[PDB]
Enzyme design. Structure first.
Site, PDB file in Angstrom:
ATOM      1  N   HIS A  41      76.515  38.182  90.977  1.00 10.70           N
ATOM      2  CA  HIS A  41      76.168  39.038  89.839  1.00 10.70           C
ATOM      3  C   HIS A  41      75.900  40.493  90.218  1.00 10.70           C
ATOM      4  O   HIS A  41      75.623  41.298  89.321  1.00 10.70           O
ATOM      5  CB  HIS A  41      75.059  38.487  88.941  1.00 10.70           C
ATOM      6  CG  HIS A  41      73.708  38.403  89.591  1.00 10.70           C
ATOM      7  ND1 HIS A  41      73.279  37.279  90.256  1.00 10.70           N
ATOM      8  CD2 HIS A  41      72.673  39.281  89.627  1.00 10.70           C
ATOM      9  CE1 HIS A  41      72.044  37.467  90.690  1.00 10.70           C
ATOM     10  NE2 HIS A  41      71.660  38.683  90.337  1.00 10.70           N
ATOM     11  N   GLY A 143      65.170  42.876  91.596  1.00  8.80           N
ATOM     12  CA  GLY A 143      65.607  43.419  92.852  1.00  8.80           C
ATOM     13  C   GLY A 143      65.435  42.488  94.025  1.00  8.80           C
ATOM     14  O   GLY A 143      65.905  42.812  95.129  1.00  8.80           O
ATOM     15  N   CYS A 145      66.816  39.522  94.132  1.00  8.62           N
ATOM     16  CA  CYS A 145      68.029  38.731  94.268  1.00  8.62           C
ATOM     17  C   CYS A 145      68.654  38.971  95.623  1.00  8.62           C
ATOM     18  O   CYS A 145      68.715  40.109  96.108  1.00  8.62           O
ATOM     19  CB  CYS A 145      69.015  39.099  93.165  1.00  8.62           C
ATOM     20  SG  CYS A 145      68.558  38.425  91.550  1.00  8.62           S
TER      21      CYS A 145
HETATM   22  C1  LIG Z   1      67.587  39.713  90.799  1.00 11.43           C
HETATM   23  O1  LIG Z   1      66.742  40.561  91.547  1.00 11.43           O
HETATM   24  C2  LIG Z   1      68.572  40.789  90.274  1.00 11.43           C
HETATM   25  N1  LIG Z   1      69.309  40.798  89.178  1.00 11.43           N
HETATM   26  C3  LIG Z   1      70.130  41.857  88.971  1.00 11.43           C
HETATM   27  C4  LIG Z   1      71.044  41.935  87.734  1.00 11.43           C
HETATM   28  C5  LIG Z   1      70.621  41.400  86.517  1.00 11.43           C
HETATM   29  C6  LIG Z   1      71.465  41.440  85.411  1.00 11.43           C
HETATM   30  C7  LIG Z   1      72.700  42.031  85.508  1.00 11.43           C
HETATM   31  C8  LIG Z   1      73.129  42.562  86.719  1.00 11.43           C
HETATM   32  C9  LIG Z   1      72.280  42.515  87.828  1.00 11.43           C
HETATM   33  C10 LIG Z   1      70.073  42.772  89.935  1.00 11.43           C
HETATM   34  S1  LIG Z   1      68.854  42.330  91.099  1.00 11.43           S
HETATM   35  C11 LIG Z   1      66.750  39.237  89.552  1.00 11.43           C
HETATM   36  C12 LIG Z   1      65.450  38.514  89.936  1.00 11.43           C
HETATM   37  C13 LIG Z   1      64.568  37.950  88.785  1.00 11.43           C
HETATM   38  C14 LIG Z   1      64.182  39.103  87.858  1.00 11.43           C
HETATM   39  C15 LIG Z   1      62.748  38.830  87.591  1.00 11.43           C
HETATM   40  N2  LIG Z   1      62.313  37.915  88.698  1.00 11.43           N
HETATM   41  C16 LIG Z   1      63.398  37.411  89.303  1.00 11.43           C
HETATM   42  O2  LIG Z   1      63.266  36.571  90.197  1.00 11.43           O
HETATM   43  N3  LIG Z   1      67.607  38.292  88.799  1.00 11.43           N
HETATM   44  C17 LIG Z   1      67.960  38.430  87.530  1.00 11.43           C
HETATM   45  O3  LIG Z   1      67.514  39.286  86.808  1.00 11.43           O
HETATM   46  C18 LIG Z   1      68.930  37.333  86.980  1.00 11.43           C
HETATM   47  C19 LIG Z   1      70.347  37.760  87.329  1.00 11.43           C
HETATM   48  C20 LIG Z   1      71.341  37.418  86.194  1.00 11.43           C
HETATM   49  C21 LIG Z   1      72.672  37.032  86.505  1.00 11.43           C
HETATM   50  C22 LIG Z   1      73.574  36.756  85.456  1.00 11.43           C
HETATM   51  C23 LIG Z   1      73.138  36.857  84.132  1.00 11.43           C
HETATM   52  C24 LIG Z   1      71.835  37.223  83.822  1.00 11.43           C
HETATM   53  C25 LIG Z   1      70.935  37.524  84.879  1.00 11.43           C
HETATM   54  C26 LIG Z   1      69.484  37.914  84.579  1.00 11.43           C
HETATM   55  N4  LIG Z   1      68.660  37.206  85.540  1.00 11.43           N
HETATM   56  C27 LIG Z   1      67.526  36.389  85.142  1.00 11.43           C
HETATM   57  O4  LIG Z   1      66.889  35.888  86.033  1.00 11.43           O
HETATM   58  C28 LIG Z   1      67.158  36.229  83.643  1.00 11.43           C
HETATM   59  N5  LIG Z   1      66.939  34.814  83.498  1.00 11.43           N
HETATM   60  C29 LIG Z   1      67.769  34.064  82.776  1.00 11.43           C
HETATM   61  O5  LIG Z   1      68.712  34.501  82.167  1.00 11.43           O
HETATM   62  C30 LIG Z   1      67.479  32.557  82.767  1.00 11.43           C
HETATM   63  F1  LIG Z   1      66.244  32.202  82.457  1.00 11.43           F
HETATM   64  F2  LIG Z   1      67.710  32.055  83.994  1.00 11.43           F
HETATM   65  F3  LIG Z   1      68.350  31.937  81.929  1.00 11.43           F
HETATM   66  C31 LIG Z   1      65.972  37.118  83.288  1.00 11.43           C
HETATM   67  C32 LIG Z   1      65.670  36.781  81.831  1.00 11.43           C
HETATM   68  C33 LIG Z   1      66.393  38.611  83.454  1.00 11.43           C
HETATM   69  C34 LIG Z   1      64.783  36.868  84.173  1.00 11.43           C
END
Ligand SMILES: *[C@@](O)(c1nc(-c2ccccc2)cs1)[C@H](C[C@@H]1CCNC1=O)NC(=O)[C@@H]1Cc2ccccc2CN1C(=O)[C@@H](NC(=O)C(F)(F)F)C(C)(C)C
Ligand SMILES: *[C@@](O)(c1nc(-c2ccccc2)cs1)[C@H](C[C@@H]1CCNC1=O)NC(=O)[C@@H]1Cc2ccccc2CN1C(=O)[C@@H](NC(=O)C(F)(F)F)C(C)(C)C
Lengths: 306, 306
Positions: A41, A143, A145
């Site tokens: 992602h 961040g 991830c």
């Molecule tokens: C991780 O650091 C990162 N995510 C990104 C990102 C997000 C969206 C689009 C492009 C890049 C860059 S760094 C982050 C860690 C997470 C945030 C809060 N605490 C954590 O552990 N991960 C995310 O935000 C993921 C990534 C992702 C991939 C594809 C689609 C949507 C997302 C958003 N995301 C989530 O964890 C979300 N959770 C959900 O959608 C879920 F509950 F799993 F269905 C949310 C709501 C942003 C926390």
């Protein structure tokens, strides 16, 4: 004496952490030999969250759309491929700090250390467990991830987790280092949620053995139980079934303490039915389930790593 | 989301650990530039425990009676001196992995990471606190002497603890890196014991703020308290007095959450008087006191280290 939630020394992993940027999106990657592994992602924007087609997004990228920074040195990307939910970026430089390593996919109930990182820089290290519901109770912010989980054996780093998602209850979901999620989770913003979780019985028993090794017996009793009768009680308290394989795995701790496994099960049965009555075990008022039998042996015997 | 007992990444310290042997006695040392720091009881035998005269034991040694091993390389000792309860061994080689570092002497209530080591090899890392009674609740076995505690700030390792002793209750005593014990303890086998300990109030309050930041308010109430009335209650529960300096230090967490410090004190007062009534806070059934205000800000804000 003493018993702490102990992580593995993290230096071998610190030397592998880098920052990966695609457009305005940044996260962490793992640099081993001439490959950087990161969550796929990184190619998404905020507009690509509900149902990204990762193959269609990636074909539109060139090697030069990926920026990889190791400390304050840029690594040039010379190839890329997607494997499951990870992206492998081939870079022009092999990491001179690459440790001896493996990739492993762990079973629920196994523990590992997490090196939480932001912008390619390590922030902290902690221990945690793969829950029966395939989540981890981590500590992660935007961040984080691409931060990884690992175990060390002798001189070999076994990487087992790469961080991707946070679920609505504040627990975490991620992949092995081949990009396969643990559990039913996906890298898209759907209504997915953690399933009902259970307590890791074999680990609770290991920790009761740790308490005896460290000199505390208050919770023991004069009873035994059959494995089947114990599991009837375990089920009522939302504990995982104890298998004969688990009993075998507890053999060494049973031998060191002189307490038969099923006798320790009778102790745990009484603690579940009665509570602790204001007492603690190893400084906890709850029954702890994030130490495996191996973790107890390691910490009570002083095992080191090369 | 999430909140874990998080240690600092340990790699910068791993690169400094060595093994020191004098006769049949072995323990760990810390190699910084061309000096190895270790506990002075490396010069003792089992017969030198009740009242060693360290000056008289040391004058009988030559540089070549000390063997220092870094990984699988011998470092030749070219000088030695005793400072308080540490021995400084000058070696022929400066450690090429010496990080930016300081020595600091911490106050009770401050936290630090411990890198537990045996035979010069790191085994694990965990977080802990200097207790009000100047012990630490560590996890240490024979051969862990000379393991160190530290904090990291930006790129600088601040070493604050070197391990020496285990007391009868299974807690631990040691020195700063200048060899001065924390507390009244000595490096001899006397009847010394841990004093009565207290709970670190300012840290409990910091952790209640962490719980609110992470989305939990169940334990708050509509009351306030004066500082003096709070301390009357604190004393009854064996909590350290809360000072105006502590209130000032909690300012940033109070501002981020919108909960006045004395209002959080009224919440804590009610938790002490009533208990948790079967509920938990951040996964604990006890009030946790080994996170400082700085630790909470660091972990909720994602601070990294260079
Ligand atoms: C991780 O650091 C990162 N995510 C990104 C990102 C997000 C969206 C689009 C492009 C890049 C860059 S760094 C982050 C860690 C997470 C945030 C809060 N605490 C954590 O552990 N991960 C995310 O935000 C993921 C990534 C992702 C991939 C594809 C689609 C949507 C997302 C958003 N995301 C989530 O964890 C979300 N959770 C959900 O959608 C879920 F509950 F799993 F269905 C949310 C709501 C942003 C926390
Ligand atoms: C530390 O690893 C090491 N100690 C030695 C040593 C011991 C005696 C003579 C020469 C060398 C080599 S490595 C060890 C760690 C400690 C053991 C169990 N868990 C621990 O954390 N420290 C000791 O054993 C210290 C050292 C010492 C110095 C001077 C005189 C006596 C000792 C013995 N010692 C103790 O911790 C003892 N404790 C006490 O005497 C006390 F309670 F503090 F008063 C004891 C009883 C061996 C644990």
């Amino acid at each position: 004496s003493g018993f702490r939630k102990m992580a593995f020394p993290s230096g071998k992993v610190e030397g592998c952490m880098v920052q990966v940027t695609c457009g305005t999106t940044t996260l962490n990657g793992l640099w081993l030999d001439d490959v950087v592994y990161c969550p796929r992602h990184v190619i998404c924007t905020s507009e690509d969250m509900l149902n990204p087609n990762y193959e269609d997004l990636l074909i539109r990228k060139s090697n030069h759309n990926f920026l990889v920074q190791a400390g304050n040195v840029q690594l040039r990307v010379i190839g890329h491929s997607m494997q499951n939910c990870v992206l492998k970026l081939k870079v022009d430089t092999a990491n001179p700090k690459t440790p001896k390593y493996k990739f492993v996919r762990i079973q629920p109930g196994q523990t590992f250390s997490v090196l939480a990182c932001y912008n390619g820089s390590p922030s902290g290290v902690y221990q945690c467990a793969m829950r029966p519901n395939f989540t981890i109770k981590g500590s992660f912010l935007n961040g984080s991830c691409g931060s990884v989980g690992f175990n060390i054996d002798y001189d070999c780093v076994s990487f087992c987790y790469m961080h991707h998602m946070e679920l609505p209850t504040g627990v975490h979901a991620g992949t092995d280092l081949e990009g396969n999620f643990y559990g039913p989770f996906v890298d898209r913003q759907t209504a997915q949620a953690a399933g009902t979780d259970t307590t890791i019985t074999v680990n609770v028993l290991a920790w009761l053995y740790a308490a005896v090794i460290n000199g505390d017996r208050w919770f023991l009793n004069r009873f035994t139980t059959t494995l089947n009768d114990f599991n009837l009680v375990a089920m009522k308290y939302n504990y995982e079934p104890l298998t004969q394989d688990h009993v075998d795995i507890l053999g060494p701790l049973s031998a060191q303490t002189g307490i038969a496994v099923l006798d320790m099960c009778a102790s745990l049965k009484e603690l579940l039915q009665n509570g602790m009555n204001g007492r603690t075990i190893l400084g906890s008022a709850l029954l702890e389930d994030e130490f495996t039998p191996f973790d107890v042996v390691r910490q009570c015997s002083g095992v080191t790593f090369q």
